[PDB]
């Protein structure tokens, strides 16, 4: 069979050989739905830029998002801060924070949640960038959803809603020394 070598998807699906195909109901694999889990991200004290790809690669989101170059995530943060945190939209100046005229939230225990409209001015944000010489590099300072200033931010979190991703890029798994990797 096959021999097309045209890289156009070909799959027998166990029909080849007298076997019926019990139905495959793929859920827990929509990028609209597997990409909506609060992922703890290392807070950077008082002023940590709030943006995608800050999260370590290993976390579920932090890795199943690098699978896609461009995402449109309508982010919604959840923070656990010690003074009144003051969000700020994209393009706001560094001294922009502490004005309070910006969206802030006073302290309500245990923690305070927010929605963050997609402010960054692009069609869609990009996970990787080219022509610039890694999350801390090879990408424009503009792909972010503001800055979340605080007296102390203890456990920052990012949740993505209605994110449809584009143009997939390869993932990777933990390379085991021996086969049948035991965990």
């Amino acid at each position: 069979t096959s021999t097309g070598e045209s890289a156009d998807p070909v799959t027998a699906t166990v029909e080849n050989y007298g076997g019926e195909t019990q139905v495959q109901r793929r859920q827990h694999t929509d990028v609209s739905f597997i990409l909506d889990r609060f992922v703890k991200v290392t807070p950077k004290d008082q002023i940590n830029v709030l943006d995608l790809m800050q999260t370590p690669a290993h976390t579920l989101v932090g890795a199943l998002l690098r699978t896609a170059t461009y995402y449109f995530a309508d982010l919604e943060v959840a923070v656990k801060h010690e003074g009144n945190l003051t969000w700020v939209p994209n393009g706001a100046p560094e001294t922009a924070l502490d004005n309070t005229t910006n969206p802030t939230a006073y302290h309500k225990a245990p923690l305070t949640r927010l929605a963050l409209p997609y402010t960054a001015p692009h069609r869609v944000l990009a996970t990787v960038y080219n022509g610039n010489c890694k999350a801390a590099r090879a990408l424009p300072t503009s792909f972010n959803y503001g800055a979340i200033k605080a007296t102390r931010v203890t456990e920052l979190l990012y949740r993505m809603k209605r994110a449809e991703t584009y143009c997939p890029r390869p993932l990777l798994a933990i390379h085991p020394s021996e086969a049948r990797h035991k965990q």
Partner: protein, 46 residues
């Protein structure tokens, strides 16, 4: 849609809830798979 399906919708309006969207004037990796060639490329005996 995503991980949020509620019968009572949302107390706030759509504009304040999510970003709004625009248009001008479909997906590709769920049509590439659906357009995959299947079966056998030659006459099958037995």
């Amino acid at each position: 849609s995503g991980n949020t399906g509620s019968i009572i919708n949302n107390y706030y309006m759509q504009q304040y809830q999510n970003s709004m969207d625009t248009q001008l004037g479909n997906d590709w990796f769920s049509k590439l798979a659906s357009s995959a060639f299947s079966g056998l490329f030659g006459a099958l005996l037995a």
